[PDB]
Amino acid sequence: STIALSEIVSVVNTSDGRLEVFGVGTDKAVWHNRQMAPHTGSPWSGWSSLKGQVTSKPVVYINTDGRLEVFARGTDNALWHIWQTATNAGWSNWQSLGGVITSNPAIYANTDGRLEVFARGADNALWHISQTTAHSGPWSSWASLNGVITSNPTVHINSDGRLEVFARGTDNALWHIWQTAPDSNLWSSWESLNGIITSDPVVIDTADGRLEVFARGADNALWHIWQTISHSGPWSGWQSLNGVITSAPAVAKNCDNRLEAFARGTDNALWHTWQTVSHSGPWSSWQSLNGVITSAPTAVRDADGRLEVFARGTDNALWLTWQTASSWSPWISLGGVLIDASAIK
Amino acid sequence: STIALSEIVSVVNTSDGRLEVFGVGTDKAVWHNRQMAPHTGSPWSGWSSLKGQVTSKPVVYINTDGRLEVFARGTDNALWHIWQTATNAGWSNWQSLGGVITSNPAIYANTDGRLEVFARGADNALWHISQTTAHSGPWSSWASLNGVITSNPTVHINSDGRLEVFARGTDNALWHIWQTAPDSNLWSSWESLNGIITSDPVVIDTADGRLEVFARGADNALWHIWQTISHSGPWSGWQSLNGVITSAPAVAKNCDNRLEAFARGTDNALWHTWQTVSHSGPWSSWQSLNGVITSAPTAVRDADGRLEVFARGTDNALWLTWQTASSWSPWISLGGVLIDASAIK
Ligand SMILES: [Cl-]
Ligand SMILES: [Cl-]
Ligand SMILES: [Cl-]
Ligand SMILES: [Cl-]
Ligand SMILES: [Cl-]
Ligand SMILES: [Cl-]
Ligand SMILES: [Cl-]
Ligand SMILES: [Cl-]
Ligand SMILES: [Cl-]
Ligand SMILES: [Cl-]
Ligand SMILES: [Cl-]
Ligand SMILES: [Cl-]
Ligand SMILES: [Cl-]
Ligand SMILES: [Cl-]
Ligand SMILES: [Cl-]
Ligand SMILES: [Cl-]
Ligand code: NA
Ligand code: NA
Ligand code: NA
Ligand code: NA
Ligand code: NA
Ligand code: NA
Ligand code: NA
Ligand code: NA
């Protein structure tokens, strides 16, 4: 019935190589901030309001034509969205995709360019809806993929083009379900990956085409589990990455594909652990990046191939640190006053 | 009526992070070779025949479901192809897509997952054909995009999803034509980018979403030209990268997005020049990677984020060198006996 403290912004590296960050202000509007230039340490726009009135984390996704699109639950509990009219232009108005949802939305593009959105319903099953044509409306009707879930869902694509969704179940195990063909409405049954998880799951694709899922465990360590064959079962056992974490974990890939995980520690600093040597190499010990943070961190690789990490500060502004040749940069403030609007806490 | 010596293999980093290389043997069959493991320096399969009888460079492309597909002109001058039945499985038979073509095929996926293939016709115009549905046959009818071209064409996608094709014209200038909308059959007119080029052009997308085109000039230097705005004109002037090159250039992106160009030099060694500092930084002087090569080089970034470069040797085998922390590795031989099967020489 609870999860580790959430990430509170959605961030992407856009089609022109600039990071762009989306969050929620105290009066429930979505705000965004973007780099002026496609480089680590670029000046930022500052926060600009996309208006709306949201009751979930707003989640941005890039259409296959490069246009950003933000999805969020509205005050009426419908799924709403707003999109760029062109990659380097302004935004539509907020429009409703209806339904009644009870989680943050999770988004992925099918191999045919149609976005598909997954969200928990009032019945605690996973529901979904999709664009009927590539990178465009109109959208399909809502339908259910069943299950009973207790965390925000997350979706990824397999290296063979099949979407796969992960969520915590009523028993606190990690569950998943997958497309049996790309672009299709043919799905598997829900299957348990076992474990006991106390955060939303995070999923990423490895350099070698396997899904790998991360989540906080019952012992507050970071745990992970992965496909042992490219786009295929069986899965590994759950394996611990140790640490003691007090937020959801965030994961990104370095530019050499080494995975790196980030989370708040018991001292409220940002901590991280990373694969060493290569993308098949052993994980480092947890090490501190300092800061005093009041959310999970959010990690992304920028256009210079460096990881940048965003986290809310004690002042409720969004702060930022990034990799340097030697080390990491000191935390800098991007201002704003942000809230955790997660539909599941 | 001629072009600089061509690249003689087609290489990709596949859905499971392994490099895979395609070439042509002395009896006109297509052969391929792949890394066992997703890492720099992996053992290789060795050469395996995909049979066929080709009269162009064979060009591999990855469908949006991860399956490889190889395109080549047949002995009957039709476009032929062969594809993986699944990403980690075997291949179909060679099948004909008809037409009569007079260049190597150039391939890209539209944002809706449909591959589109461009090839010069008997009239020296650019013709095209596409999959009617994402990552699958059947294919459309052939049609023409007009123009009069004197090099192999190359296609890329803009950061807004619009395909764009580049080719040398009768006047030896660089010409181009583009989709006016993603996934569409609406194209612009051919427009000249001027210059005088003496190789096939090479095109790549920058980290900041601009197309940048490279080609040998009339003075045998490497020249380049780029979109000055993301997915948009106007283009820059032609600018020289200096050097004296005796093959077509090859270009790839380092894992921090710095572009790096490769070509054979006057001493028949492999030479290279790269952006320094960042993807917006100045280009280095040309420096040697040694070797004695009998083709243009072919460059690709591997699953460890390192560039690997392939080139035919004096013995007609394919040789290989890659980036190390300090330097580059000594050339090693992958064997085989390869030919330049380019439909335009
Ligand atoms: Cl607000
Ligand atoms: Cl609005
Ligand atoms: Cl509906
Ligand atoms: Cl995730
Ligand atoms: Cl540790
Ligand atoms: Cl990038
Ligand atoms: Cl600091
Ligand atoms: Cl809050
Ligand atoms: Cl042969
Ligand atoms: Cl065959
Ligand atoms: Cl036809
Ligand atoms: Cl190219
Ligand atoms: Cl020089
Ligand atoms: Cl890779
Ligand atoms: Cl050597
Ligand atoms: Cl030859
Ligand atoms: Na942008
Ligand atoms: Na980008
Ligand atoms: Na996801
Ligand atoms: Na999340
Ligand atoms: Na492969
Ligand atoms: Na790959
Ligand atoms: Na191309
Ligand atoms: Na080429």
Numbering used by the authors:
A (entry chain A), B (entry chain A): 25 to 369
Quoted from the paper:
Each repeat of the PHL lectin (W-motif) consists of a four-stranded antiparallel β-sheet connected by relatively long loops. The overall structure of the PHL monomer is very similar to the recently determined structure of a homologous PLL lectin, with a backbone RMSD of 0.65 Å. Additional hydrogen bonds are formed by residues in the loops of all repeats except W5. Interestingly, site 2F is occupied by the Met60 side chain of the symmetry-related molecule in all structures.
PHL forms a single domain structure, which exhibits a seven-bladed β-propeller fold organized around a seven-fold pseudoaxis of symmetry.
